[PDB]
Every structure is written in C-alpha cells, then in structure tokens.
Symmetry: D2
C-alpha cells in the first residue's frame, strides 16, 4: 500500500544514476534558490522538447497520444489532458523526477515538465498568449498538475 | 574499433535519462560558465562521496580496492592508482559522464570525479595540504587522469 | 490508483530487456509446461542465491536484514519475515518478475524467488527437513507469499 | 584497450538483471543441450520480431535503416548489411547478450538474433527459400556475423 508505492516512487531511476543525481541536486540546492532552479529546469525541459518533437495533431486526444508516444520511449510516465471549459489541464503520472532528485526537491524539479509541454504546445500551433503553469493544489508525489492558460 | 567504442561510450547511460540529462547539461551550459559548472560538479562529487563512504584502508592497493568496491555497485567504471615517487596518479575508466552530459561537456562533468576522490582521501586520513586536481594531458574520452598532490 | 500501480508494475524492468525477456518467456511457455518452468526457475534461483550469499544471522530480524541487503543492491523489492508459531512466512514486495516475463507468467516466474530463499536458508543452518513453498492464497501481483515449513 | 572493451561488454546489461539472467542461463545450460537452447532462443527471436515489426523497405540501405531504428529504441547495438553477389551478410555490433547470459553462452544466445532477422525478412517479402544462419568464422565477442542464403 503505502510502502509499496514509496518503493516504486523511490526506485524508478536506476542504480547507476540515483546517487549521482541526488548529489547534483544537493549541490544545486546549496548554490541556488528554488526559483532559479525552476528557471533552469524549465529551460532544460524546453531543450528536451526541442530534441524530441511531437507529431502534428488537431484534437486534444491526438495531442495526448503524441505526447504519450514521446514519453513511452523513455519510461517517463504518461499525461492525461482534460479540456475544462476554456483551459487545458494536464495531469502527469509516474515522472521519475522524485526518484532522481529526491521528493523534497519536487518543488523545483517538476518545473522540468512545465518546460516540456510548453514547448510542445508551441510546436502544435498554440497561441503565444498561452503559457503552462504548475498549479500547487494537489499532492505532487501522486501526480503533477499543469494548466495551459492565459 | 572506433564505431564500437563510440557506441559503448554513448550508450552507457540508460534510455530513461540520456535525453533528460543532455537537456539539463544544455541548460547549465547556457546559463553558467565552465568554471562555475566545475565548482558545482565538484561539490556534487563531494556530497556523493560523503553519502557513499569508503572502508578504511592503509595501503595503496587497499584504497584502490575500496574505491572500486564503491564504484562497482553503481556501474561507474574503475580506478587504477599508481604511486609515482611522492604523488598518487588516479586513472578512471568507463565513467558514464560522457553518455549522460555529452562528450563536449566532459571539460566540466569530469570535475565530478575530482570532487569524489578528494573527499574519499579526506576520509582515509589524507593531509589537508593534499588536493586532487585533473591533469589536462591525455584524452578525456579514453580515461580521466587525476593527481593527488600539493 | 489502479493505473499508476499497473504502470509501476509493468515498467519496473528497463526498456533494454523488457521485450527480449517477454519473447523469451513466450518461447518458454510454448515449449514447456508450467511445472517444468517452475523447476527451471527454482534451479535458477538456487544458482542466484549461491552467487550472492547472505551474511550469517541468528535472529529473524537479522536474517531479513541480510536478505534485504542482498536485494537492495539489485533493485528487487524487499522481504518481510514473520514467525507464526512454528513456521516462517516470507512476503516479498516489488519483484520485477512481472515487468519482465509478464503478469500471466507469474504462475511460474515467482518460483525463482522460491529457489532463492531456500538456498539462503540452507546457508544459515536451516534443517534439511524444512523447505520453501509458495502459498497460492493471496494476489500474486500485490506480493509473493512463501512458507518455510516441513 | 582490452580491459575497457571487456568492461563495456560485461556491463551492457543493467545491475537489476545481470545476476538473474546469469543464473537463468546457468539453469538452462544445466538442463538443456546447446542445440536445444539455440532452438529456444531462435523462437524467442521470432516472437520478438513479431512484436516489433519493421517498416516496409525496398532497398538494402532502407532495410538496414528500419532494423537499426527498431534496435535503437532498446539499446541493442546496430546492424550493417552488405550485398555480396547473391547473399546478404549482416554484421551485428553491441548485442547485450554477452553481458546478460555470459560470454561462454554466446554459442547459443546469439541464436536470438538469428531468430529476429529471419522473421524481419519474412515481413519484407523475402522468399521462403532464404534462411538466416550464423557463420562460425569470426570472433563472436567482437561482432555477430549472419548470412541470408539458400
């Protein structure tokens, strides 16, 4: 139940990189504030999305399928998109960020995802007035909730 | 020969983290200079060595055995230590840094190792006057050469 | 909830070996019956336990600590041992067998664990009259329950 | 040179599965003869190729590109195809079979590849008279050489 979920969350990253990435996160936290780390990881996510473009889509389900197709080739969870009235809500499950950088660093590591979807939307013809922002409403460990809005 | 060695070097990191770490390295290079990145990675290596202490050793071969025992549990290559007159030369093989952060970033990513061994020496009674420095003399891709000297 | 647990269970094995091990399991199922596969995987578990011996223990908690210390170096879940009257019950969590060989093959792949603990008990002075057997009472996906009894 | 190549070959498989697959290979060798293991792994390769079909191609370079595109998503080396007169010679580099099942088992584990390309050619309209056979002429460790012939 709780212990099994904790083990799955903590061991999602491989043995080769868990300690190294934890040490890197520790050094980053020592040198920089959480906001600077959020900016850094957002730019990293933009670069990642640039290196892994999504196929052209027209509908919400097609965009979700393209994003999940990109994700499934690297074992990075999956995204569900819901069109609530005018705004799109993106829920990402099984992001391996917690296993690598630690749970307490999810306050900034999650910004990486915020950097990806944004750029992906820029590749799908989304208006520049729209931006992706992380909503601090639900538990970050369970899922990461983002909103594409003005 | 060359292509097989290149493939082995480029694919040492798993598919789950290669793109993410490449994007993170790209963002880090965009924001900070190589010297600041070297300082950051050295502190990261110090934290990594603190989190994974080495068993007490007395001889050079025992120190090598302890360091290799720590390395082999995470698939991070191996170290050979030679005692030339007064100074110790450490040659590290098969560091997965190139596969993760890219070959062109080895100018600073290798500093991570410089941060590890240093702390490990501090754990084995090495005098504070001695420090570990990377010698820019050989090919970085083949092996990483470090000197423990004054 | 259910989808997240399913994703964690299915993606525990790396991308490098998931398809290859699934194909190997398919070929094994086509060629051999479940009982023969159980015997084969039990012998495989015995060999694995021989290659990775456990440190000598005296109490139940120390035995569990040694077994978990062996497991944690390879990301293979963890074991809880309970001494019910005269028999030991071992519950194993987060075995990556399902991610590799598929859920429907857990009827025989779990025998691998039955082969490991047995040998480990033989290394800790357990009487030859005692054997490890898998109890088909609970859900195999949630946890694997084994009994060390006569 | 030699130690680096040996380390890269022996550590291609992750820490999570190296010991388990070695134990499984030991059990398979104890129970079955090499020819039976070759048949089993050939059928496994056919199933793997069925699960991961290649895109339709017309030329030799296009077929090689499709096969390498399938391989590169799972970190399984790469293949080079040469058209010598009437027969196709396939050289596969960086197969992780040796890291998993051991070098001494490459006498049969390589049959897995023999099972894949065969089925792949069956998907590309190759005549049923043509079969893929492993040529025992070169060093298995360096590369795996296969011939598609009558």
């Amino acid at each position: 139940e709780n212990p099994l979920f904790d083990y799955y969350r903590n061991r999602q990253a491989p043995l080769q990189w868990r300690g190294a990435l934890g040490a890197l996160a520790q050094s980053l936290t020592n040198h920089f504030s959480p906001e600077q780390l959020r900016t850094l990881l957002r730019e990293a996510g933009q670069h990642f999305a640039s290196q892994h473009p999504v196929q052209a889509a027209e509908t919400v389900q097609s965009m979700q399928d393209a994003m999940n197709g990109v994700w499934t080739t690297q074992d990075w969870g999956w995204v569900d998109i819901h069109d609530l009235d005018s705004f799109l809500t993106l829920t990402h499950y099984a992001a391996p960020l917690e296993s690598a950088f630690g749970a307490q660093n999810l306050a900034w590591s999650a910004a990486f995802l915020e950097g990806v979807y944004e750029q992906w939307f820029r590749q799908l013809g989304a208006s520049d007035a729209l931006h992706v922002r992380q909503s601090e409403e639900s538990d970050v460990r369970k899922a990461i909730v983002l909103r594409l809005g003005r």
